[PDB]
């Protein structure tokens, strides 16, 4: 479920070959992590937005379906708005990581 999302991250981290900056987190406190995912999930769509691509929409969509349902809240967490702003590269990768944490849980 969480493992499916990794594979999808690659397709895109590809299909992309630019863009701008997304809100990313790696200071990922286990205890603040479902919030981190939500932020990631939103941001993710910023790619569909910029990309006219059909295939990547279908991909982020597949990913959201997985993620959304997996999740289905916490305290003291950082808002999305107050996250680091990284590249389409670091975001993706930083996504990959936060999925892993979910995995080991």
């Amino acid at each position, epitope marked *: 479920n969480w493992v499916n999302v990794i594979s999808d991250l690659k397709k895109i981290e590809d299909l992309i070959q630019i863009d701008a900056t997304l809100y990313t987190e790696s200071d990922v406190h286990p205890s603040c992590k479902v919030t981190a995912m939500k932020c990631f999930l939103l941001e993710l769509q910023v790619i569909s937005l910029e990309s006219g691509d059909a295939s990547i929409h279908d991909t982020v969509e597949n990913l*959201i379906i997985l993620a*959304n349902n997996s999740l289905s809240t916490e305290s003291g967490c950082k808002e999305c708005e107050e996250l680091e702003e990284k590249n389409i590269k670091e975001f993706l990768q930083s996504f990959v990581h936060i999925v892993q944490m979910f995995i080991n849980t």
Partner: antibody
Amino acid sequence: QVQLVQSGAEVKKPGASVKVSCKASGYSFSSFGISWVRQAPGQGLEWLGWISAFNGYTKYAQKFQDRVTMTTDTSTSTAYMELRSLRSDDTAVYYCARDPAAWPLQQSLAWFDPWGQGTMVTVSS
Amino acid sequence: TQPPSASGTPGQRVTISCSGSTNYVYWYQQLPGTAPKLLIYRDRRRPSGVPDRFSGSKSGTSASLAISGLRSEDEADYYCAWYDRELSEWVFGGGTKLTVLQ
């Protein structure tokens, strides 16, 4: 191709209710959300609120929170807007728009794309 | 807060101001008898299918919609939006009717 297709023009009396619908096509209605905005004739846009087509969680605008009820039907890929105790000044075209937020926290970073044709609502006694 | 009225000649570069007191600002174009459509998001960004001509900027305590290369097709109402983090609500500029002259 993505579409939102809403219901037809309505005519209502004060104190009455309207239920506007908003049918979604071309995507996973349920992975996302719907935002409702309205426009009094010859006037501006005002956001009514929002709903996650995923969890049914909602967020109402203060101005409407007392009379709106937004819902969705995963099965018919339809969001609904219900405004009650209709008053005169509720006369307005009501729109729906896809909204990337399935979760309330995300909703602050939202954009509305695309939009339904809209649904004229006239409140006349 | 935006001017209710804006004028422009074809090929002209025009500007629409959305001011106030400071975060992110969005732009929507409502062609005459249609529903609004997303023009600009997160201040600067253009969703796919939104012409170069269209660009947004934020400066001081006020963002604006720079629309160049002007055409008649561009004749519409432009609404800026933002999210009142204090009210936890979305709010809209009052709008700016834009007339392309002929």
